[model samples]
Target: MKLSLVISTSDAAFDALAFKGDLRKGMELAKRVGYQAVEIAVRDPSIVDWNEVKILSEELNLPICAIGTGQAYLADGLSLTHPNDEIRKKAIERVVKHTEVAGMFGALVIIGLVRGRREGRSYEETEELFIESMKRLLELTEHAKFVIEPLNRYETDFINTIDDALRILRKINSNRVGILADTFHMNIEEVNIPESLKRAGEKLYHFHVADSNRWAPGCGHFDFRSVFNTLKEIGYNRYVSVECLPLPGGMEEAAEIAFKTLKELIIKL
Candidate 1:
């Protein structure tokens, strides 16, 4: 597995999770700090200069691991399962654009907060809309894989566990659809982290690593050794990206420690 860190391209409420508001500086720091890849949290695809991203990736020799879609909800208040049809359509279009951008880098597109909450709708109704939106999104993208991240209940009312994500993938039933499991979310929802990772197996296309307190690995009491061992057992040769807060230490220290700690554990595996 490879190591990556989340980098937000614009200012948003979720900027505290990574280096925010500057992609060039974030990418440079990621490369200098020994990150193999960088996951971008983008609010809109049109605002980004693809040529700039391509040049930076080529110059730094660091790949874009994934394209995150959560900022669409945070910045634009759009969601695939929103009550309004127009809003849902806008959310789908945004995701389609994100998928196309990620396709250029051969990276996965994440479906996080953009899945939206139940709001006033029933769970069944909201799920139906989400499924329909995903179907349309899949039809629009030919080269990109979409991964649904099962966020915690505090973040969203829908898909709070790996089982929840698997159910949606089963309904979508598409090869390009997969799960983006996060250690922080699993710490709250999964009965057993390693067991959940094993259950996800091949359908797990992307991953996020953070400790119990949303801090970098080794800062909390998370059993990363077991997590890495399970990943190796399942032959997960993908990116294990860090999506933690830059806490206790600043961004530089957080990124450095996370990469160093996880790299040591992975080597043991």
Candidate 2:
């Protein structure tokens, strides 16, 4: 099981101005922490430089296994469940562009926060609109595998549970679409992580591992042992990404601890 880290480049920015240098710095820090891979938002994977990333990968021997996209959703108000047709079309276009970029790195594109609707949208309308939007997006990116993560209710009114996600996937009926089971969100909603994974079955494309307190595994209330055991039972072979936000002032340190803890947990399982 490979472990990757999520490095949201926009986290270093305020307002609309982004800190590009900080994004590179974060990747370098991740490499130094003994991580073999990292995940970053994909508006443009070439944010730093593709050649430079290739060279860095060669030097650090770290590979980027997955790319997530939340730029429009996080920075702008783009969403798949937007009531407006034009906004939804633009969102799909931007994300499809990101999908092409992810293919360059041999990574799957993760629809983390961009999978659903924002506030003010009715659940019924959002669901129908999202289903239509996803069908089109899947058809556009048929060559690439897209993983959608369900967020907690507070984050997004849409896609709040495994059941919701499963139903959407079934309706879309596209081979390109899959589910990204995130433990952070699951910690708040799932009664049993393993059981949820089992229920998700073949649709589970990737796993986001994090502790209950938003720290690395073993630093919070997460039961890593049971989680791993369940993963093993389910025969899940996808990459397990560290989606935990680094504790304040300890970004680098927390990443190192997270990688080490993940290693230990994998061995114990």
Candidate 3:
């Protein structure tokens, strides 16, 4: 159970959750602060020099845990479920490119806001579009892992629960695709977070750890012991990346607290 924190390559609105801007500095800080891995959030792959990133990662011994793609939607108005065909194609291309970058680092690519919303389209039409887009993306990146995150309804209307993600994966019927469960979102939508984790089981390829208040774990009243125990029971020995707001403490302090608390919990497991 390796612990990690999100790190963005550029300054974005979501930078509050983790370190942002300088990749080298973020990786160094992650290593110094006791995180074994870092989840990189990048809006464009072209802007990043993979060779440099790989070299830095090896030097720091802080491997990338996952590649986040939400910025594609935030920075650019791209979406898999967009009504415009050209816009949707661009979205798929961006995600497929992200998958390629992820493959270079042996990291999983995350699908979040890029999944798009229903907007005014019929539910069936929107779902069909999303599934079609996912199939195309999966077909191109069969060797890479792509995990679709289940965001809360307030964030996106599509795939807001583990069950929602499971249904999509079953329909897509691809081995390279999986689910990324976030504790912050789960706390809002799931009746029992641990039970949801058990249900995800082996399909849980990636994870995001946060408290009920969207703050770092231990700062809020979340039973992380139970969550970690369930993850162990399910044989989920993967990255549990922190994707939360820095509350009660600054980003550095919040990250340290998360690592300490989760590391202790993981050791107990």
Candidate 4:
């Protein structure tokens, strides 16, 4: 699964799901689309039947590249930096659970919304809490990698740029902890998108692609050609998940367009 060109864009239910919670069905479509892998977005690890997912993935000859945990933060308020002690503990336990299962699929856990939204807390207070929480996660989970994603300003005030993400990942100083950059978020926050990708260096663990509109790649006016070329130049050998909305078109249309566009852009590089 490492150093592969994988596309991510679907989940279980709601949000960016391509197949309404049916792992088997979703994977089949991914396979048909010529995707090298799939990433799952689970609200709660306990709700997913790992055994079934594994079996289906093997049957379809697909790999689960990474696991997304943003839904947990959005749905259950489970985040590493919550102010409440019990809630923070709950978030840690939940992420630990995600790590445990992520190991089985040879996937990394994405710390998107699960990093917490900075509202009342000052930046200093929030980051201290976040790093301390990460120390615990880093100690508890030894195998599964954790990708710290920098969401857009509108979505998160904490880490909104690749530089912010790199600062945090470097401060953590763990090889298992890395960065996940989403083009959608990057479009809004990054001054030079290609340069940011280069700045991440080896710390860049995962990548996501969505156009300016947060839809399929071709739907928006973003420059994916430059993005892919920079990725090639940087030797970015990892999964590129299409974590976007199936908008202006439904799942089928969105999925077809995304994979097709991704393949064309990537093949040239």
Candidate 5:
């Protein structure tokens, strides 16, 4: 297992992200803070300077373990289940571009809030649309790994639990895609967090760490130790990224607390 922090090249409405607006600076801070890896979130992949991203990764020796795509939905209102054909198609296109970026660094692409909500649509209707979109995306990208995240109910109407993600993955039936479990959201939807992780087992592609209050781990009552043990027991040797709000002290404090708490847990285990 490795420790990572989520950063965005562009400013986002979401407050949970520790670093935003400057990708290189965020990567530098993550490296300085002793993180082994970093996760980059972007709403527009086209605006990013691919060379700069590459150079920073090389210079810092900090691998980008994953590329987050949720900002596209939150910031631009582009989603797989969008009623607008143009917007829906654009969302899929953005994901394709993100996949290409992930391929450059051997990172997985995140499919989180980008899944969209049902709004007034029936569950059946929305799910069918989402499945169709996933199939369309799978057809476009062959080698890139895509992790379908299960957001909390407040965030989306579909796939709000690990079982929900697994059921959807079963229908998609692609080894290239797997589950991205966010502990913060899991606290809201999952009945047993560790049990859910165990259920994901080999299909687990990525992990997100945050407490019940959407803050750093150790700032709240969420069980980081149990989560670490369960991941180890299931042989989940993947990137565990901190996707939380820079709260209380600020970005530096949130990042450090998360690293120390998780690092100590890993060490004790």
Candidate 6:
């Protein structure tokens, strides 16, 4: 499986002003750390010059494997399951924009935080709205695979498990949408991580690899061997992304450590 690094464009803004390094610089760092792909959190693709992204990707031999829509949800203050129709419509539009940008880079879209509201939303309503939204997005993406990620309760009070994600995925009933599992979240929600992965079965598309504390994989109490073995059993060979905040003052250093750790984990498993 491929490994990817999360490089937020917002982080680029700060890094550019503070360290004089932009998105291209971030890509270079990730590539230097043995990452062949990067996940960009895009609030607005219009703000990014795709031509430049293409040039950078070619230069670093790093493709944008995933486009995360979390920034869109943050920018709009809207969730796909919002009670307000106009708000939800705007949220759906943001998702369309995200898919459009990701498609250009041959990347799948990750629907995590933007899937729906967390607290104060009924499970039924949230699932209904999310499923309805996915139907529209399925038509929008055409043949591209989009991800449905479930966060932990602390990060997102609702849809905090694979069971919740599968319920929505089954209701949507589309081949275009698939599951994006994160080991960090599963550590909190899954009684048996390997078993849960087996249960997800073929619906699993991508993985977010991180430890329980949102750190690099081998630094916490996770069983990478069992996890990778389980994934192998389930035939998961897509991108496995490291989605975590690196240790303090170790962004660049932590990335290489993460890639090496993941490589070792994969081999050991």
Best by TM-score: 1
* Best candidate according to lDDT: 1
Residue 116 miss distance in model 4 (angstroms) = 0.4
What C-alpha lDDT do the candidate models reach, one value each?
A: 0.87, 0.76, 0.85, 0.82, 0.86, 0.79
After superposing candidate 5 on the true structure, give the runs of residues whose Cα lies further than 4 Å from its correct spot. 11-21
Per-residue lDDT tens digits for candidate 2, residues 86-195, read 87888888788777777677878887677656567678777888888777877786577888888887787788787778988998888788898888788898877788
Worst 10 residues of 3 by lDDT: 12-21
| TM-score for candidate 6, residues paired by index | 0.93
**Distance from true location, Cα of 132 in model 4, Å:** 0.8
Candidate 1 per-residue lDDT, tens place, 249-268, comes to 98778888888889899888
Off by over 4 Å in 6: 11-20
Can you list the residue pairs that collide in candidate 3?
Answer: none
Candidate 4 or 1, higher TM-score: 1
Per-residue lDDT tens digits for candidate 6, residues 1-269, read: 78899874553333435222457667888988888798877665655567767887888889888888876677657678778889888888888877777878888888888875645767777787878888887876675679889888876766889988888888888877889999989999988999889999899988998877778777777888899999899988888998877753477766777788899877775
Spell out the clash pairs found in candidate 6. Answer: none
Question: How many residue pairs clash (N, CA or C atoms closer than 3 angstroms) in each of the candidate models, in the order given?
Answer: 0, 0, 0, 3, 2, 0
Clashing pairs in 1: none
Q: What TM-score does each of the candidates earn?
A: 0.94, 0.89, 0.93, 0.92, 0.93, 0.93
Worst 10 residues of 2 by lDDT: 11-20
Candidate 1 regions exceeding 4 Å error are 11-21
Better of 3 and 4 by TM-score: 3
